Amino acid sequence: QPEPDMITIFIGTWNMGNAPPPKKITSWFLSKGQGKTRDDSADYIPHDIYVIGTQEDPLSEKEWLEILKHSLQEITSVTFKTVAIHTLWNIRIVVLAKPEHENRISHICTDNVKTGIANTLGNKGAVGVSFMFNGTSLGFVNSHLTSGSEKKLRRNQNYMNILRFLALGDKKLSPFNITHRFTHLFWFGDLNYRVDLPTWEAETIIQKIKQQQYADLLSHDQLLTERREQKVFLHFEEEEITFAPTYRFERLTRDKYAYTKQKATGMKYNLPSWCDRVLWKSYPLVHVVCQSYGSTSDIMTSDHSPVFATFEAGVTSQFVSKNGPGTVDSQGQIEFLRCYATLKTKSQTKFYLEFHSSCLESFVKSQEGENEEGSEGELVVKFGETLPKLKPIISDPEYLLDQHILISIKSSDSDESYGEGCIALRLEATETQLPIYTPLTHHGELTGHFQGEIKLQTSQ
Ligand SMILES: O=C(Nc1ccccc1)Nc1cccnc1
Incomplete structure (x- = not known):
């Protein structure tokens, strides 16, 4: 059945x-x-x-x-x-x-x-x-x-x-x-x-x-x-x-x-x-x-x-x-290129990301990003090409393209989330740099945005 x-x-x-x-x-x-x-x-x-x-x-x-x-x-x-x-x-x-x-x-x-x-x-x-x-x-x-x-x-x-x-x-x-x-x-x-x-x-x-x-x-x-x-x-x-x-x-x-x-x-x-x-x-x-x-x-x-x-x-x-x-599928990987967070906060802490997904064995912590001041007052946190390569547990595209990555941007000083969002892996192409985007919220209110590019490698 x-x-x-x-x-x-x-x-x-x-x-x-x-x-x-x-x-x-x-x-x-x-x-x-x-x-x-x-x-x-x-x-x-x-x-x-x-x-x-x-x-x-x-x-x-x-x-x-x-x-x-x-x-x-x-x-x-x-x-x-x-x-x-x-x-x-x-x-x-x-x-x-x-x-x-x-x-x-x-x-x-x-x-x-x-x-x-x-x-x-x-x-x-x-x-x-x-x-x-x-x-x-x-x-x-x-x-x-x-x-x-x-x-x-x-x-x-x-x-x-x-x-x-x-x-x-x-x-x-x-x-x-x-x-x-x-x-x-x-x-x-x-x-x-x-x-x-x-x-x-x-x-x-x-x-x-x-x-x-x-x-x-x-x-x-x-x-x-x-x-x-x-x-x-x-x-x-x-x-x-x-x-x-x-x-x-x-x-x-x-x-x-x-x-x-x-x-x-x-x-x-x-x-x-x-x-x-x-x-x-x-x-x-x-x-x-x-x-x-x-x-x-x-x-x-x-x-x-x-x-x-x-x-x-x-x-x-x-x-x-x-x-x-209960192991990785070496064939599989998720790469984030040229990513940055735009945050509405007045804070000046350093920030790091956490990537959470049931396609990972456990969540992944990034390095701290590079804070810049945006044109119209805002905080821009740049990650460049620094973000960890994510290793999914299964590489079959019939599985991986149906998954999602939750992202939290957290203060280094307090480890508190300043924003949460979600990226689909249901991409138009694999092995191809493609734009990604999510709004970020905290306590369900808009706090920022996360955007960049993704490169997904499946077993196919
Ligand atoms: O909620 C709206 N769009 C949306 C919904 C879910 C996710 C992202 C965007 N539009 C809206 C709301 C209330 C009155 N008119 C339009």
């Missing part, structure tokens, strides 16, 4: 509003309702992995797992295996996979982050799961961020705390946060960003939604505007939104948005908003295609509608050769 080179992944996010679900939730897992929906001809075809994120979840883990497994068995006639379940307060993540994948999945990690301080610590935060699927690392984050239209900057702060402190994936990747640890990272939840229009415009917004005219609402969505201004979710993708706002509904119908201020809301307005979202970030030049992004219309126990997204995702096989794993 051949190892897959693609899988499909279901992502669900639902703020359940502290209510039990209705008897039937199959529409969610079938990607049926509003938006980019899944073709009826696929309804019996199971996804490889289902990742369910809930917020305000009133159920026990056992109670929700039974509902989810029942739901999938009714759709697919497959009994899914539980990969992981993790709950923080009423924020939960469940990962289910087809039984045929049980031996393909390993290195399962879970963690949570509690956001806020004192008053604002005790119900918001995130849970996450990561694992390896054959040679491919997968990460999943379900976050419930701060509520309220006038708290976008708190949400952004909650995002940075979660990506700094959530401890998933390979702990040896010490300079790297979750935004660099995975081939594919999915981040979803009740992110709680709102449509920023005046309160007086509530009925006008409702009208627009009834006309399925979302453009003038999406142009005020705080998540899209904060992402455009590089305030949050830098280097993440989101499919185009073509479904109505998923919050805030009267329960037991979807005919009414409940937006007016009430004692129950802390006298806050809840204008119709796209609170419930799925974003992703995959390594450069890895296949990832969104095949659905939408909301259900028939699950009405909460003041939010469930959101679904599905993905095709490239995966690779657990490569063995006669050499690697």
